[PDB]
Structure formats: structure tokens, C-alpha cells
Amino acid sequence: KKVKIVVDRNPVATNFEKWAKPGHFSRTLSKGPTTTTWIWNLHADAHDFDTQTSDLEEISRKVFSAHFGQLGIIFIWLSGMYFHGARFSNYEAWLTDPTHIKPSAQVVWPIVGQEILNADVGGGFQGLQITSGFFQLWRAAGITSELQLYTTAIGALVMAAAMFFAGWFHYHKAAPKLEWFQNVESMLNHHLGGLLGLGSLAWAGHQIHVSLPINKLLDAGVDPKEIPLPHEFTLNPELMAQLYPSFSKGLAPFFTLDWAQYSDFLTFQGGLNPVTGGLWLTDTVHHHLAIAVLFLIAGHQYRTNWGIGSSLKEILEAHKGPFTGEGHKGLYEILTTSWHAQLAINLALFGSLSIIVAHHMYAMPPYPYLATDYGTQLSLFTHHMWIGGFCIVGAGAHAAIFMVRDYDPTNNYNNLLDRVLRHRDAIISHLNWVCIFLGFHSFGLYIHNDTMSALGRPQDMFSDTAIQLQPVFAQWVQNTHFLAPGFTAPNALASTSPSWGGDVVAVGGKVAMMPISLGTADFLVHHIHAFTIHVTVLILLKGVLYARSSRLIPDKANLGFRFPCDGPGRGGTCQVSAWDHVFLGLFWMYNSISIVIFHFSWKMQSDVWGTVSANGVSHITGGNFAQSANTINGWLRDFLWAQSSQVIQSYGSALSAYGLIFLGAHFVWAFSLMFLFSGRGYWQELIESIVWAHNKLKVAPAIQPRALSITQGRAVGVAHYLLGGIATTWSFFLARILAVG
């Protein structure tokens, strides 16, 4: 009772005694490295704190310190980004010409002819073209000078040192107790208002006193070296008033509830800025202020040290109906004592959020000169899509882990979890049927179109000319959003994004955003996406639901979460554990995300990105998506074969690296096949023969070489498969977009 700061003093001594004893955290790794399997086991269980100790307090302390270390690593990475943008970039020159100078923040040394990678980006600078979008972010923040980037890099280094010190201090000096970690009410109250709300309010303040004036002058047209410094605008209401007249009144309108006076810098316009092609910074300021107020208000719902507030346990236990028996009872105990359940929920929502971010960012470019940078747009979208997919797969994996280790039947009786586990057969069977139906009605349509096209019967295909499959619902929603301003949003001057419809927003002769028409090809690709997502969900859900027991193996929970099988009996139990379900879900997630990014790339290159010549829009691919994306042959020829000429012809130029990785990735992927179609027995016997050869020359090692375990073989195969495929797509996308963008 009573939320407070409870901490234990000096729990772990600081020394290098355990650094010289690898495998000290695990009890099973104490007999020493008798075989090579010990080396792999040392790394496969380094972060599995649940196995290193049975105490939840120690596990929580380890997680907290690991989080601090991760924060320090991220800060080091950020510092490196800012330092490279301040010392090995053309940001200052790019500011004067953001439409012709290609951003670059990496310079290579001349050693073995690699200096060819230093492309002629522009502004008297040579380097590698970057697609992270840091230049646009810095411009939106009003960096302008390189000294500010250097200062930010130094500050990031200081923050990294602070994070590492915090982790060491919280693990060896002042370690929080278990009751401190279980304060979900206090944690939520602080993360909602003190973190998200306060951060949004602070960013809004910076945007008001730094981003708005500097960016306004830049857009109006003023040399970056002539714009006043940020402090000259943050501490001088006269100049800022010269740029925004509502500031001549100070803070009086805010406290008198006459907020309308602030309508000059707190607008609700919409669309994009015609000069930069991005969202109106005033709109973003207003958005951040509104969400900050909302988050601050939301950070006052849970009860802590006072009577006011709500109880998570009380709210959960009060939500029970006639179809769910007991209801949400027991969920609070699960989420307050199991780290894997929280990790699963957080990973799922985190990945979904990343995907939503990718969508909202290409639809509504939030940074200046970002939409016209096709390379940056495609790179950001694809990167966030992959991060989201990986996080979702991890969420499923941790859900299965919790179901295998932290599940307790005595605490989950007749509740949501128990009832779900009591009818897993119906869920899995229905999901399997919907997956089969989607696969048929989605892929068979493409196969039918291919067969008709090959048979000389284009009138029997599922296209916009023959049997039409118009997405009436999507088109209706799109038109509804287009007609929203002045009707279902009277205070809105334009739609959220030009994709809903309207005019074409072009910046510097290139189309920044334009309406995206949906046809039969869009209908087909959307159903393909739904089918792939459903199959991935089926695999992950099946693993989570059958991780404990199954009709084939009634004691699967006893075998653990990660085991290769249960022998060749019962016909075969290969890949029956939850870990194997995650292993297969990774492949399906890769397939789904790959199709998603391919669809996005082709659609933007055929119906969005292009040039304006006062006579129309000349798209990159000429709009061949609407007439070729309805068949697999079109995707293979008009997209894979047609757009791959940029990466296979990059030798001898700056993009040659993309041509090398493109091949290297192809190798790694194929390499994975060796570990995916093979078994452990063959390699063990081959190693036996090689060991005999070594013994014949008295060069056999004491650490008996052993073939990788079945689980390790599967992990290596899946890791190499995804690395090769993702890297191949990365090289192809980057080379193509950097050569035609």
C-alpha cells in the first residue's frame, strides 16, 4: 500500500571477476565448454533472465538496467548521426538548394578504388546519398547551421553517458524493489502525462519559438545565414510578432480564454504547404498542443497515494458479460507479475504503430522537401513496415513464451484466457478456412488472369476493361474524406492528404502528392495483403494457443517453449513447439511485408511520383500498374525485370555498392537454404570424418566440434533467409529510386 520509492543499497559489487568467467549467469553452463554447443548456448540464453534466476525482483532489475543500456546505445547512434551531419555532410549547402542538391552524410576513404562511392550529390560535396530523412527533420526543426548539429551530437554523447551511468547505478548501487516495479497505476500516470504529454508540450513550445519563425523565413525565401538565431526569436516577442502578429498581445489571450487570437500560428488548415510540399508547421504545432493537453488529462485516471483515481484491477474485474463467464478477472495479476505478457502486448501495439506511422508519413509528408525526395519516402516507408512486422512476430513469440512459463491454471479459471484456451479448435479451424478462402479468391484471380492472357482471351480477365472488381467501399471512404472540409469539418480549409482527391501538389517540378485512384489491381493487391496477414496471424495464434498442450502431444508444456520435437513417433512431431511456430511466422511475415512494399513502390512510381510539364504529369513508370498489376507476369516483367535494370547496371558508378550488395544478399538468402533443407545427423557424421582427419595429425580440439542443434539450425536458416531477402529488396529499391528519383 502507498506508492513510494523502495530501493535496495549496493546489491551487486562492481568488478571484472565475472567478466573472465563466461557462462556465470547460467547454472547449466558451469561444466565448461566440453563441446562447441556450449558456445552457442552461452549467447542463446544471455538475456533469458527468467532462467538465470527464479526471483522476479532480480529479473526486473536486470530488465531495468538493460533498458538503460539500450537507451545509451540509441543515444550513441543519435550522436553519430548528428556528428556525421555536422562534419561529413552538405546540409548547409542543401539548405540553399533543397530541390536539386541530394542529401549526403557519409564520406568514404580512398583505399581500394572505393572512392567511386563518393557521388556528386551537389554543392561542391562528394559522398554517399542518404535516405534517412535527417536533413528534412533538421530543416523542420530550424537547425540551419552545422554548429548546432555538433552541439546536439555532444549533448547526445553526454546523454548516452548518463544512460549508462543510470543503468550501472540502478543495478549495483540503488536497485529498485519488486513492489516499485509493480506500480502500474503510477507508471501509467507518469508515462501518459509526464512523458507523452510533457514531451508533446515541450516540442510544441520549441516549434512555436524556433521552428515557426525560421521555417517561415526559409519558405518566404531568405538565405539561411541571414535568418536570426533561434534565441533571437525565442526571447524577442517583437521580431516574432513581426512574423506572427498575434504575439504582440503576449500570454494575455491564453489566460483570458480568448484563444482565437492565436489563430495565426495555431491554424487548422490541412493539406500541404505548396512551397515545401510538407504539412503546415502551424497545424503541427496545434496538433502537438492538443495531444499534449489530452495526454496530460489522461495521466490523471489511475489511483495512487490519494483517494481520487481509478483502479486497473477494479475496472478489469468489472467488465464481464454473459458470453465470457468470469471476464477479465486475473488479467491484472498476469500483467503485474509476468514480463513476457507485457512484452507481447507492447510489441504487438508497437509494431502496429510503426506500420501506421509508415502509412501516415507517406500519405501526409510532415517534413519540408520530403515528399519530393522519392528515395527518402520509399526508404522510410519500407523501413517502418519491416520494423512493424518484426515487432508483431516478436509479440506472438512472447505471447507463446508467457503461455508456456508464466501461465497458471489456478489463477485463470473461467476467465477470458481460460475460455479462449477451451475453444482453440474452433478459432484455429475457422481461421484456417478463412485463410484458404482468401488464398483462393486472391491468388487464383491472378492465376486466372495469367491463363486468360496467355490463352489470348483478355476479355475474360479480372481487370478494369473486362470483369471489373471495383473497391467501392475504399472509393467511397476516399471521396468522403475529400468532401470533409466545409461539411463534416467546417473549420478545415483542406483535406488531411491530397490522396483523397483534389488538385496535384507539386514542388520544384516534381509531384509531391496527388490523388491515388483505386481500381481492380488495388482490390486484388489489398485482398492479397489480407490473405497474407491472415496466414501469419493463423500461424502465430496457433502456436500461442497450442503452446501448452495439443491432441498430438498432451504434455507439450512440460517439454518447454523451445524444443526441436518429440521424436519421429506419431508419424512425426517436427517443429511442434511454439518457437517453431514463430520460426514459420517469420517467413510468412517476410512474404506479407515484401508484397506490401512492392505494391507501394509500384503504385507510387506509376500513379504518384513524376514530373509536371504544364501539360500533365509524367509518372516514372507511365502508369503501367493499372494495366499490368492484375497478373503475375506483369509483376515479374513490368516491376521486377523492368525496375531491376538500375541495380544491375550500377557497376562503375556511385551506386556500384548497391549492385554488389544486391548480389551478396542473393547469396546469403541461398545460403540459408542449406540450413533449412538439411538435418543435424548428416553434418554430425561429416564432422566425425573431419575430426578423424584432425586426430590423424594431432590437431583435434578439446572443445569437441558438434553440429548446430536442430533449433539453432532453424534459427540460422531463418535469419539468413530474411537477411538475404530484405537486403536484396533494400539494394534494389535504393538503386532504382536513386537512379530515377
Binding site: 467511397w476 471521396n479 468522403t480 461539411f487
Partner: protein, 87 residues
């Protein structure tokens, strides 16, 4: 009810017989949500012969009115059968 085991009690007619009393209130613009929906229903064909074209005022009005009616119906049924939210 006469058939099934539908918990939709007959006394629960207040859902659908009370939602119009609130949706008919004018919203400054136009004249009223239900009024506009009914006018569109009676003008843009008797929702059976030809059709409401593609993305018309009738479509959004019908979707919004049905959204409100359905949410009121289900929430009221849950509340009434829950007996002062005894769950």
C-alpha cells in the same frame, strides 16, 4: 421473443423509439440529421429502383444514422439486461 433466445427484450423498444428523438434535433447546418436522411431517402429514389449513385449525401447520412441507431440499440440492450450494471 416469439422465436430464438434473443435477449432483445420487448420493453427495450426505447432504443429505436428514443434515438430519433435525439437525432432529429437540428445541427445548425442543413436542418437535421434524421430530417436530411429522410429527405434524401424520399428524393434520391425510394432506395430500391435505380440507386444512390457513387458516394452521395444519402450514403453518408444513412451510414451515420444507422451507426447511431445501432450503437444506441446495442448499448441500451446491454445496460437494460445488466440491471443497473450489476456485472
Amino acid at each position: 421473443w416469439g422465436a430464438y433466445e434473443e435477449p432483445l427484450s420487448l420493453v427495450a423498444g426505447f432504443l429505436g423509439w428514443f434515438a430519433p428523438s435525439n437525432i432529429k434535433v437540428p445541427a445548425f447546418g442543413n436542418e437535421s440529421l434524421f430530417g436530411a436522411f429522410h429527405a434524401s431517402m424520399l428524393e434520391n429514389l425510394a432506395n430500391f429502383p435505380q440507386g444512390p449513385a457513387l458516394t452521395d449525401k444519402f450514403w453518408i447520412l444513412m451510414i451515420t444514422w444507422h451507426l447511431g441507431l445501432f450503437l444506441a440499440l446495442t448499448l441500451g440492450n446491454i445496460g437494460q439486461a445488466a440491471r443497473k450494471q450489476g456485472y
